[PDB]
Amino acid sequence: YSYTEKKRIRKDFGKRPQVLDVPYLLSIQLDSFQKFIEQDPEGQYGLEAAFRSVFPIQSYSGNSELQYVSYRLGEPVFDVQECQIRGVTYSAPLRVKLRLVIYEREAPEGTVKDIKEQEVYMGEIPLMTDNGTFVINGTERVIVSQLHRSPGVFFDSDKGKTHSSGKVLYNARIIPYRGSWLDFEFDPKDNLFVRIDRRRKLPATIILRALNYTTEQILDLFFEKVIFEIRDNKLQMELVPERLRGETASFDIEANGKVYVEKGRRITARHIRQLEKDDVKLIEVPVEYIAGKVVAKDYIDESTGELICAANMELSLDLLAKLSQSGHKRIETLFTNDLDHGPYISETLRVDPTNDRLSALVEIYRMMRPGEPPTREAAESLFENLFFSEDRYDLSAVGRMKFNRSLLREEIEGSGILSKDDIIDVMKKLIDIRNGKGEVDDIDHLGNRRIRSVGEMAENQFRVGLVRVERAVKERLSLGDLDTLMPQDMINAKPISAAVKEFFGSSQLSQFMDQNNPLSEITHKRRISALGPGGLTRERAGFEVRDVHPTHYGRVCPIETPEGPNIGLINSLSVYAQTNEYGFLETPYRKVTDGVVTDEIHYLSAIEEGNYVIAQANSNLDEEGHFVEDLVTCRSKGESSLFSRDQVDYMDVSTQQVVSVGASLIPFLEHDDANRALMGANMQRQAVPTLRADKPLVGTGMERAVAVDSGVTAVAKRGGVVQYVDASRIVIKVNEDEMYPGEAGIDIYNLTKYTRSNQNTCINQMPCVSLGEPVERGDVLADGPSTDLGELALGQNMRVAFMPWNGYNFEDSILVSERVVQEDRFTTIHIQELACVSRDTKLGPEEITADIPNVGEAALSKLDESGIVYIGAEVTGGDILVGKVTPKGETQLTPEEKLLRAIFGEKASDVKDSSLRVPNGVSGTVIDVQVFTRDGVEKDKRALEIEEMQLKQAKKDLSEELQILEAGLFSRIRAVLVAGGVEAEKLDKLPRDRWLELGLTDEEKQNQLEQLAEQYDELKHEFEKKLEAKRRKITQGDDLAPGVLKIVKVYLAVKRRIQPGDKMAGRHGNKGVISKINPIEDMPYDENGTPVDIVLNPLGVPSRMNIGQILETHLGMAAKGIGDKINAMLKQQQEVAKLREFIQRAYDLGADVRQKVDLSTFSDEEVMRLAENLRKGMPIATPVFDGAKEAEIKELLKLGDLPTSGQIRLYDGRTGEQFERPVTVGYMYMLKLNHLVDDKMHARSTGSYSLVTQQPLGGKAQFGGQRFGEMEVWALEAYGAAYTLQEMLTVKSDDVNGRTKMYKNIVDGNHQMEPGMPESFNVLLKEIRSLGINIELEDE
């Protein structure tokens, strides 16, 4: 165990030892974008692919061409730190090397004529952070991975297009990555059709004719052959015994010597073996049997040379006699069967109105380009371009892979284009399914739903940049002069830059990161959606897509999805789930070798899961051996049942792989309905981090994993002793073993201090380590905003009691103590950012001075001379943060204003007022202010005072960097020098600037002194340019929008307290509004005295069926009971041995506890730092499904000297008399949701008005009245209340006469109805007249 773990250990009730440790939760995002930038040498991926795909581009003549060489990423212009602040993309320069090669025309190919070569910029790509975020215009944003239909082939059937026929019409469809669609479909008459792009319906033999296939070849491909011999006089026929199977003997079937079946009799399997063993080959048959049979190949009269009967024509008695005497006594016909080998292509050819190959390419061309007269080349070029050109078509790797394994093929990897083989093979399996063998695929299987992460999508959007450049290259090359024109004159850098920022902004997948909680960040990066482009739509979305599919097992979470119309589409990834190398999902599974459950793990694809039988994690291992029980509950083929030992092939690794991150944090999830579990995990993401991070007493263990992997905390890169602790930063000295021999070895971690969130909340990093503490590699050094000793801390736990209270907990309503409010524990932080813009209007430029017309000295008190409020100044709604003034033009001073400005005076300057003032209602403390100015107009004096600090603070910060880096660099040289020339004080006489002067003997360590000497100089020279970059970027004028001159951004800091209307919940979906903050006098309390924090309603439990909250309460109480015992011994100041015995007795209690922590190993000092953190309550871990049960919880309650029941004797605070009978009391880890009432309440009397509708605006954002919709209207119609409605149609909304007139009447007291007629109707009159319709108001 580690040091940071030694400070506080979580008691784990797990009994299934983790063979696989939880992976880095942010794997997909980082690995995906890594592929995109990765310049792979050959195996093209990301950009390298995009260039090789499009390039080389050649002119339309084909005499000049542009060729891709190599590309590179320059380091970012502005780093994350700067980018987040300024407000522009965190992107890197794209420099690609291009080569313009031109050929000789009359000469063959004079390739060596002018091999021009240079490097060119095109577009700046937003880079990804180490958190998996993109900084777009100063916003860390996340691109959600998409879930879409995997390319290749797919067989479906509308189970009743025409329920008229009620015929299951089967259809096939070839889905490429790029290219046109190719569908095959039957019809009521089982005629095969082909519909490219689902355009016109064309006979399915027309596409085969286009691939040069004669009527004969077509038939020869699908149908089998039936041989007819006319020997002497008796007509005869070849019989494969396995043909007249399940049919009726229409004639008398007799052989060389025996009559097998009689006329009108079913030929059974007996009769088939009877014939097959007799080795029957030939049978004499009647001529009436052929009438109906279809002739196969063409048959010309040997004599004349004319077709007696063309291929694919139903024979007759007279045609057969015409063929017997022509001189053909060997006839070939089709093996037609209405049951098995079906005749479809045959009946289809009879519909097919085409003739040869060239004519088949006509109707294909007349479908897609109707109206243009077709030529040999236009018809051929089109068809060849569709599915048979390296340009238009691309199945890709996944496309060809799925396409092949769908056809049970030979190849995994093959060609991007459809071959002839592929098409007919697809028609063949469509016809297989139609016959009976073969099953259709379904889309809901994840084996068909591929996952597409950012890097592949960034690649796609980067291609369109190259495609849009392809246009400008070719056209400029051909007509433009060859020599003069340079390659960068033909390239444009905007189409690529614009097409990529289109993705990093407008796309549905690029959305603002939800970062109001470590869990929100990590679960929102692990979000997977089916929506946006190339996916589905709420309008288009079905049910079976949304429904949980048994493939989800281990891959996707069954309980993680919004309860909004985007319910089943959006989904989080499972805990141990990972992406298949091709795209599908895969889940870890313990291989079983010869019965022995081996520790070797194999990530099985969505496809191979169905194959093997998979035991559940509930199954018991025999401590290195096999399943303890002979029978094991397992699952396969998407079903579940019991199996024998040898039959088990694989097993679930952990018991938590079914669920996601969101769900792995819910304790006793096993005792919670999926409906409430979903809501609980959805609200756990909305948990605003509190003032003081409180650890959860009732956790799962996943706590630390989330907090650490979220990238919100600061974990140690290298272990050693913390040389320096600070609120702003941490300095750690590395140990010798880990420390590199070249550098000094002293890591720097400047912790992110209080600043804004995307949801306007606090972000802080407090040091969770003491000055001079020995820390191990990979240990949490600073905690985040919602983390505590590295473990996740979303909300706060408190003593809760389930019982009604005078209906203040009616429908889930919450009754919280004032004592919770006194500790300010659920009091939250909200950092709000407001801005002041100096624009350039038509009249003139605006500026920022303290000189503001029409103002009180009271307003300009908190401002300085420059016109910006002081840092630390309290502000309230109405007070001005930043003084601004704009130009005032021709202004008609109304007589009453000209007289009023002439009486009291103050002839306001020709400069309008628009100072940024605190919004009416907000009030906080200004924590910082940032000033952005264009490179030009002279600055404010305050903008100079802020430049003073940035500079002189950066000069200090860099001085401190080179100073401590020097001390760590000479610290090494000092140890190197002792090895060899051992002299202590005599060496430390003169100063340290003359230490590189001293050396050693010819040795490895002499080379080391030279490394450190010239690396000390390397840092000494580096320090100047580090200072240059800082100094310039502080002097640099920040580029702004056109019209803007300068901006001043203010940061307020609001401390909102909990109050009635605030929404809180547990993690079991148990919602509730705080109704009343009860006095400490009135709160119920136990016999011993300590009161309850929250009083919840017990009726929010049976109907809900989320008993996990009650177990959370009971365990929380037990856990606290143990903390209360430890708290008492630490207060009593007892002993190390006494605490050791009790705590060892606590850690070891569970049946088979996973963690077996011996305290004899812990030193006395290590025990007391542990007990000191255990006194608030022994933190417990209840794995998701392998959690604690009653036997364990009630046993823990006996250790805490708590009741076995969990119900305590409560006394009413109001009164003092006991309640009639016991109530459950314990500690439930509840949360403070983002839905706070200060951000909800709204009111309006009269305000803004809409632009045309002339009704009020909408929302408290814009100060708009509530909408009274038609449903709201019918309610008043029902009442009969006519004026109350007419009042809400006219004076309260449009009626321009009414609204102002009524206002004046109300202040008069005369609340009198004065209607006229809403504007929005007078609009509708003219709007219908604008449509050319006479709509006038006919009078009385």
Binding site: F543, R546, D547, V548, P550, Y553, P558, I559, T561, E563, G564, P565, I567, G568, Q616, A617, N618, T633, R635, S640, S641, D652, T655, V658, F668, L669, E670, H671, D672, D673, A674, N675, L678, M1105, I1107, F1185, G1187, K1189, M1271, W1274
Partner: protein, 50 residues
């Protein structure tokens, strides 16, 4: 399903018992969101005639 869920919420569901519970849970809550528009559209249809 031929084999139903034996356990209750006090005793605790195993891993599948929950996976099975999901199928019914999500489809029940899918018809809370999507099927509501047919019934609210009926209210609209009825009103206009009446």
């Amino acid at each position: 399903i031929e084999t139903p869920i034996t356990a209750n919420f006090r005793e605790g569901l195993n891993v599948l018992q929950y996976f099975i519970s999901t199928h019914g849970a999500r489809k029940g809550l899918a018809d809370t969101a999507l099927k509501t528009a047919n019934s609210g559209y009926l209210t609209r249809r009825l009103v206009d005639v009446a």
